[PDB]
């Protein structure tokens, strides 16, 4: 029997199988408003008892660094998300909204009034990386503005309000994007965070921001509706730490403590496999070390296949396995994995284009 199709209780959510739609930015949410195309896309991939995580979603007007990504900070956005959540729920799926602030991984073109993006630091991403522009060219990451503690508290409140908005739209929960060199990771990683106040220096201080964000959303909507994504070891946007495993374990310790204090477990911890990039024994052991340390559900992501996902669940390395690129090109990926049916190729050229159909909803079913 296939271990990916054993049921799993993710808190109060009864999942029928362990194949998860990973969060993926696709840039079809024109003008940051969820569009009907998103409803068709998520409906195609929804299954009864299956778990879906949305594309990263803006928590505020300054949180974007990609074109046409959805927000959930306005009532117009909430109204349009509600239509998408309804069609997914009609298929029996569980769906979480990923809350995403890019921090310094932005550009004047994505910021109100062309202002500088915000970060923990004034250090820019280096010129080894270039940002996708709305016209399909690539631009230069600018120097960010380093925020003070008042502004940090405002950003935490943006997460809190967005979590409440997600519940209003009908989402089952939210995921905190704390990975991949974006705003939260710019506080976590000692290769970025050069602060001398209470949010920088020590490992404890670098973990303060993610702790406050998670506590804020747990207080607002309940721990069992909150997932947290991190990537202590990742090659993306100059987000390195001198001791990735200790960083990961410090975050896990904080999450365990939040659960004890709240008297409830989070929905899950979601960790990117260090092998995953946008453009091996030590890697696997880092994943298992974090899993063994965390008191709760563990989702693994990054480079998984049918065989590797089966291995992960069978060996106890993870409870759930999220798939990205193969879910782009296989709307019925869950069914194909169950049947061991051949998978369709994906076309990177249309990952981030705006067409509501081409490269988005026109990948065929079996
Ligand atoms: C087009 C694309 C967009 C992505 N956008 C996000 C995102 O918005 N938030 C996030 O946490 N991860 C994002 N990722 C990472 C995926 O969630 C996932 O971890 C990765 O695709 C899994 O590896 P796989 O593609 O080999 O399955 C993205 C990946 C792709 C390919
Ligand atoms: C390389 C890791 O970064 C990602 O996967 C991502 N978002 O988190 C995007 C928008 O591609």
Author numbering: 9 to 287, 298 to 384
The article reads:
The biocatalytic reduction of the oxime moiety to the corresponding amine group has only recently been found to be a promiscuous activity of ene-reductases transforming α-oximo β-keto esters. By studying the crystal structures of enzyme oxime complexes, analyzing molecular dynamics simulations, and investigating biocatalytic cascades and possible intermediates, we obtained evidence that the reaction proceeds via an imine intermediate and not via the hydroxylamine intermediate. To gain more insight into the reaction pathway, we determined the crystal structures of the two enzymes OPR3 and XenA in complex with the oxime substrates 1a–c, either by co-crystallization or by soaking. All the crystal structures obtained had a high resolution (1.9–1.35 Å) and showed clear electron density features for the oximes.
To assess if the introduced amino acid exchanges affected the overall structure and the binding of the oxime, we also crystallized the tyrosine variants in complex with selected oxime substrates. The protomers in the crystal structures of the tyrosine variants are perfectly superimposable with the ones of the wild-type enzymes, confirming that the exchanges did not lead to major structural alterations. Interestingly, the binding mode of the oxime substrates also did not change in most of the structures. The propanoyl moiety of oxime 1b points into this cavity and is likely stabilized by hydrophobic interactions. Substrates with an acetyl moiety (such as oximes 1a and 1c) give the non-productive binding mode described above. Interestingly, the exchange of the canonical tyrosine (Y190F) did not have an observable effect in this experiment, indicating that fast protonation in the active site is feasible, likely via a water molecule. On the other hand, the canonical tyrosine variant OPR3_Y190F showed a 2-fold increase in kred and an 8-fold decrease for the NADPH Kd. Though a parallel 2-fold increase in kox is also observed, the Kd for the oxime seems not to be affected by the mutation, indicating that the canonical tyrosine residue does not play a role in substrate binding in this enzyme.
